[PDB]
Amino acid sequence: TTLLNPYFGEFGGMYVPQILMPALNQLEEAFVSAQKDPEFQAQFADLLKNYAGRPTALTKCQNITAGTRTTLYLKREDLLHGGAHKTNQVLGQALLAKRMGKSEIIAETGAGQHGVASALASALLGLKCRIYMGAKDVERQSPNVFRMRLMGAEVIPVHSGSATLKDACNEALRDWSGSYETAHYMLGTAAGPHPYPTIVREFQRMIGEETKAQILDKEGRLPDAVIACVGGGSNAIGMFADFINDTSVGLIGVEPGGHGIETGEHGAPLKHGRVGIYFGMKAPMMQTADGQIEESYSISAGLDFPSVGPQHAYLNSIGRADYVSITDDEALEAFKTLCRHEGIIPALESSHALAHALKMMREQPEKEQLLVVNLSGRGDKDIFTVHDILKARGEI
Amino acid sequence: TTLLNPYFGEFGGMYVPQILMPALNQLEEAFVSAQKDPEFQAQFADLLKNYAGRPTALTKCQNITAGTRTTLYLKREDLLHGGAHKTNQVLGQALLAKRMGKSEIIAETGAGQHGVASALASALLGLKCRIYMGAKDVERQSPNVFRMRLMGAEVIPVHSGSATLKDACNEALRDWSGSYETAHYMLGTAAGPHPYPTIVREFQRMIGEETKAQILDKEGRLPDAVIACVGGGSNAIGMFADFINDTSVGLIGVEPGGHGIETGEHGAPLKHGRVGIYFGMKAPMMQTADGQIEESYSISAGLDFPSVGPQHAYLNSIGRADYVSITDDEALEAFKTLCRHEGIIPALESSHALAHALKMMREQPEKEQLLVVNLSGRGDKDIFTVHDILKARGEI
Amino acid sequence: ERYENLFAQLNDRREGAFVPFVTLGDPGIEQSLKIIDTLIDAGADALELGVPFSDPLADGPTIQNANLRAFAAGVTPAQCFEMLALIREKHPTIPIGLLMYANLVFNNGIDAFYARCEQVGVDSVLVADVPVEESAPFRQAALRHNIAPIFICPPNADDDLLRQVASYGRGYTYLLSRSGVTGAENRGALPLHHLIEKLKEYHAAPALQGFGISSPEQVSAAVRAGAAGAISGSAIVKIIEKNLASPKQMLAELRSFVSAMKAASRA
Amino acid sequence: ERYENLFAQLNDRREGAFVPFVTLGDPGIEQSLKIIDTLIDAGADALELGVPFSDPLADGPTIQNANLRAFAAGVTPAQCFEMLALIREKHPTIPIGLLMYANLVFNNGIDAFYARCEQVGVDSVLVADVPVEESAPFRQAALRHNIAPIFICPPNADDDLLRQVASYGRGYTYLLSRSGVTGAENRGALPLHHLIEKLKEYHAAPALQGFGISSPEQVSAAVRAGAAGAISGSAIVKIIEKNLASPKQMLAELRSFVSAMKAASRA
Ligand SMILES: *Cc1c(COP(=O)(O)O)cnc(C)c1O
Ligand SMILES: *Cc1c(COP(=O)(O)O)cnc(C)c1O
Ligand SMILES: N[C@@H](Cc1c[nH]c2ccccc12)C(=O)O
């Protein structure tokens, strides 16, 4: 028995070993209690405003949309402390861990951004942070590993399985199953077992709440659509959440198309995967014909995850939100275009959402549309990846 | 004849070739006109708020100061778009260039941060940006050079002289002397010939203005002292400016001590240089006994400049502000300490200001003092420099 | 019906059950079939068999590597069911229990999985990552095909969980020794006597203690504490991993260990 | 007094002045002294001499490299003043003008610099990075030691600047050909006739045109336009740079160029 519905339609649930169910029940109850506690909301608001930098700006890009009838705004989560939206929910989860009397933090990470976000929240709030990371990702992300250790976190390489994000996800759950009395699992996206999809959404919904108030002040009406990249689903659902009951506002999630859907080397399980049960949830997944969890791919490591949050699968199922894919080359073009015309270096993650917005504008240039793209993070971390690709292609 | 006093006491002036004096007179008049134009201030405020992310937070660091009677706040210019305070004044100068009908931008840079700041402002506002950079600095700062070119700027290596910042400063003035009818020189600090020290200060004084209103709201009184690093002087004077007439507030500028003042390898001309005339100003300078401009040094490239803004020399002369130095190792310790205890990676520049604040706290731990450090930028750009130093010393 | 017959015969002999666990196809199909025949010949009362899965999030390094070795052998779930059919044809009375992860059960349809289990003669299915709270469609499909749904009684179980495990479990109750994941190096440090008697009071299926059981004295302590037997996994798999280079010595050491563990079940 | 005597003798001969520029100590002290003696022997009417500075922000690549070569020779300002004393002792009538950057004048004290200039027989000082608006302490120190303060008349000079340059200048007026920095490859493209007559109307010191003058026809055009002569720097230094490997051919080509430029000053 739970306090909240663990399912979004047929997706979601709490598919963990029996030993972990008390930990999930405790987390749901502490979350429900925190949401009604004004002292918790004041401390959370105090950290978001005076430490993370909220509210973030809503920037109108006039050079980007010249010659068309599209008006494009960027929700500037790239200006958030840490350079990505992840900082929002890790501050909330760290307060939840302290509310439950926990002193240790477990986190998984692949690109390294959630590891950095978990490490800075733990250092600030006096928490011991250990981070599981696939050994392949430890080698790919030497800068982020150093950032985590600079802030006192313990980074533990995971050599089991494919030695990447899904294998770090396993090891965090293995650890948590033997330590949940003293350690909290700071899951890094709006996925996994209930109540994590609900908690991460509510700890990220200020993105959409601010966007609504800001777009109403600047344009006097709601957007025609909000667009966000979907790797696990947290930045997208954070933008979507406050607009879900506004049925005129479109909700567009962008999954990584990788080298192309037809190549099989992508990260779009919601539209091109198959429903399975893994990581504590029933959700679309990239998997073999036998049911082995497949490896996803994207130029953007932050979108490289074989599954997706259950609320996005539900929103797609009922047609409340639409989900598309953007290839590496499309994201790369959007990356270069925003640098040149707006002076903003976007994360390759967020470049996928911008690329689809540029596609909506370019394909129908005389369509009058007010679009908001969630710029989930900055792209300074991606300049080496972009450099080597343009250098190998002779473009530079 | 000028509209404003070109001198701060005996320091400053307009020591440029005769050919450049009309360009300086035009700039001073357009600045004085812009300061009285509410349309200019609204456009500047619109860019600062909705594009750069102002106002920035004022973060109280409680873990840093535990066990002492120091209360420390950090002015979070690291959260500004671009990751450094420089973005403030480049947006103002770019608007001034458009006010004068200029379409091209000239900029010098050493560490690369002002080059990035000039490039993003020019890309946003439709300006053609060319950046002069010493060939030694082009090799040291490959990431920042790529950022500039990503945003459409032309980066021109300077091989003359010592092929570093002062040599890039020469080449920008050489260029400007033959192009000022169509190009504006976006000088990168509160130094050089009048009116640049005045303009950059007024385009950075929102740092102190926000700090005052924020510290009054949170503590109910002014700070006992504000502390800022001084490389050229822009972030320091931006913090100092609004407190200058508050005679109870201390003003403390921190010059880079390098490997130690006694080693001669430092960047502290204000306290250990000698007054000379170069870069269009009379100011303290690191120079040989014969009067050749000497090369400064710091672990932090952004503080590596053989001279200093004239208003800081004046404030020191009359005793309104005090200036100290912080070595590489002291800045490195402050860098690691802020990462571990607050989850904020500071720029090695700003680490010098934090290091002195930590010294004020540690040397007199029972002294009750309210301190504000200007965190002029974030330190993600410095993690490779910090890594190699700790690796070479066997610390990692 | 095989569990009910086994526990009745063991009760007549004042005996507990020793139930080893191995991953199917580890280190290869042929050697695994020879491994399993050695476990039974050495005195195994029942079998717990895992199907190689890409992400065994309830297993420690020993069984992680067992899934890795079987992956290196190219062992598929379809090949595992052909093994199960041969094992059931070789041993008609020993209870065969599967230890599954949810995705492999859900993949080709929940009902089709348990229908395939019935075709090959499997007696019970435990799904490691499906708690009692999510077990409704899985236990319904199991019972429709005469498969016993296995539920876990963790050491921190409240009274409500005790009643559900007793009311919905069949064949046997998996009595968890400790928190954490599988591993012979970690032993449960909580006396489970109160949970054993509570399960008997609620007419639960006979309890088999698992996790950490690696020595004969642990089997005897489990039987003495009131449990119907004990399950040993990582201790068995370590013998496989230790003797990967000598398949003949692998079977010889498996026989000595299982025979010693089974002898400890005699009260 | 040397400029006033030179311009009077040149006016008697219906002649303009040709004033070459070199950096002192380029490429070495001895060769520079031999360079300067060759310029005078080839018909140079006056000299403009630069002291090697670390940051010559008014000079193009040609003279940037001249300062670099003299830096490579270790030429110090103190060594430059010993050269100036020898040059004045070798040629008692030719006007010697210095082209300085402000820091070298300010370094050991402004007054001490011009006192040193008087001791060695320098006739004028132009400070490249001190405009008329900042020239007060520099021109006072110059006049106290009988040094002519040289001021620049740029091509965009308004009437107010024309009067100041005329009212405070002595020896000669530096008539700038164009904007930008020094360089023979770039030639001034504005007729300076109106500025020349305005300077004469305000009784300014005789005008010498500089920047870009690299051909005989430019010297003749400057004299025909009303200027008292022309200054050539980068064109001279390029001959030094071209013949660094052959010091003898360097002096031979310097003599041919200077003799051709001086012959162009004859009206
Ligand atoms: C980690 C990351 C993502 C992907 O995470 P989601 O949960 O899918 O939002 C997207 N953008 C940025 C900048 C990220 O750091
Ligand atoms: C460039 C820089 C400085 C030095 O510039 P100032 O003009 O002295 O302020 C200091 N801090 C940061 C973060 C910088 O980027
Ligand atoms: N891979 C990204 C985001 C991420 C963290 N945990 C996840 C779980 C599922 C999907 C994505 C993530 C990171 O580590 O920073």
Ligand SMILES: N[C@@H](Cc1c[nH]c2ccccc12)C(=O)O
């Ligand atoms: N060196 C830093 C700051 C800087 C720019 N121009 C300067 C002039 C003087 C002193 C410092 C600077 C940069 O290039 O980003």
Ligand SMILES: O=P(O)(O)OC[C@@H](O)CO
């Ligand atoms: O590996 P151990 O710790 O014995 O756990 C038993 C498990 O392997 C089968 O249920």
Ligand SMILES: O=P(O)(O)OC[C@@H](O)CO
């Ligand atoms: O180099 P140029 O262009 O001739 O300029 C003259 C200058 O060198 C001396 O005043």
Ligand code: NA
């Ligand atoms: Na995904």
Ligand code: NA
């Ligand atoms: Na300096």
